């Protein structure tokens, strides 16, 4: 419209922004793994590498519980899903690149949602 639309701040405007975003990131194919937490072991030495495994599920669920009271909180979690994906999963394993794929989309989401601030 004509408002700020670049600085959410409020834990509500954020929560659901981040809620709809996470939704969209998750909606974004590339966020197919981050969606649900990994088996920690079915995963080829994943938890052995991934000292920081976050999943969009826990994200929107934490976000649900009203944990995304901060724009970046949301991020550290989403950004995190991407991190672990890039941490172990190769950029050719369809996993990592996915991180980068959605993370890109996700990037347009946040910046659009005035979230992202780097």
């Amino acid at each position: 419209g004509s408002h700020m639309s670049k600085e959410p701040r409020d834990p509500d405007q954020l929560y659901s922004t981040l809620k709809s975003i996470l939704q969209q990131v998750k909606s974004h194919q590339s966020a197919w793994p981050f969606m649900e937490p990994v088996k920690r072991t079915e995963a080829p030495g994943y938890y052995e590498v991934i000292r920081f495994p976050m999943d969009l599920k826990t994200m929107s669920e934490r976000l649900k519980n009203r944990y995304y009271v901060s724009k970046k909180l949301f991020m550290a979690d989403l950004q995190r899903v991407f991190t672990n994906c890039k941490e172990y999963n190769p950029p050719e394993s369809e996993y990592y690149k996915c991180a980068n794929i959605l993370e890109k989309f996700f990037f347009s989401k946040i910046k659009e949602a005035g979230l992202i601030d780097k």
């Binding site: 793994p33 969606m35 649900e36 937490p37 990994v38 079915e42 080829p44 369809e94």
Partner: peptide
């Protein structure tokens, strides 16, 4: 338990 994930994880074919 009884989770239906999609992360193939186990090396088999992802690209």
């Amino acid at each position: 338990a009884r989770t239906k994930q999609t992360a193939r994880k186990s090396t088999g074919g992802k690209a």
